[PDB]
């Protein structure tokens, strides 16, 4: 279901971060004791799926704070600032991968989110 966008697959990833966006769009006997112990085994899966959907809605709420919503890919009007780990597009294209891309932006993630949020509120009235 929609929880499969989080973690339900054997997704190898590893392939280039830039080229990974192509996959982004593609992405019993009636025993009383057995029943009373299967109840928890099932609630432990209902919890997982329900948490998946509310986490989805939380991300969409944050995206609505960021302007683009329901959008798998966004292009916000904030040019990249080199002050966070000055690198070059060739290295970002070649030597990076999605799982390997958070390790350098882990510290700048909060400030990136902050500016991204603050780059919108002035559009409403002027």
């Amino acid at each position: 279901g929609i929880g499969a966008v989080f973690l339900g697959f054997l997704g190898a990833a590893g392939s280039t971060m830039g080229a990974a966006s192509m996959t982004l769009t593609v992405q019993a006997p009636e025993a009383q004791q057995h029943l009373l112990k299967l109840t928890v085994w099932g609630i432990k899966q209902l919890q997982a799926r329900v948490l998946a959907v509310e986490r989805y809605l939380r991300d969409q709420q944050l995206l609505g704070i960021w302007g683009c919503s329901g959008k798998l890919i966004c292009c916000t009007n904030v040019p990249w600032n080199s002050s966070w780990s000055n690198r070059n597009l060739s290295e970002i294209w070649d030597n990076m991968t999605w799982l390997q891309w958070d390790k350098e932006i882990s510290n700048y993630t909060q400030i990136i989110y902050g500016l991204l949020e603050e780059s919108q509120n002035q559009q409403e009235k002027n």
Binding site: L10, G14, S15
Partner: protein
Amino acid sequence: ENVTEEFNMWKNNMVEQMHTDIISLWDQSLKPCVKLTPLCV
């Protein structure tokens, strides 16, 4: 597949979780007759 993860047997926190859980297991399972706890300052 084709995924590399930086495991660390020494900074694992699951170990601390297990330690606390087992501590709580023994504290209830085994009853000592005369316990002695310093609790210094």
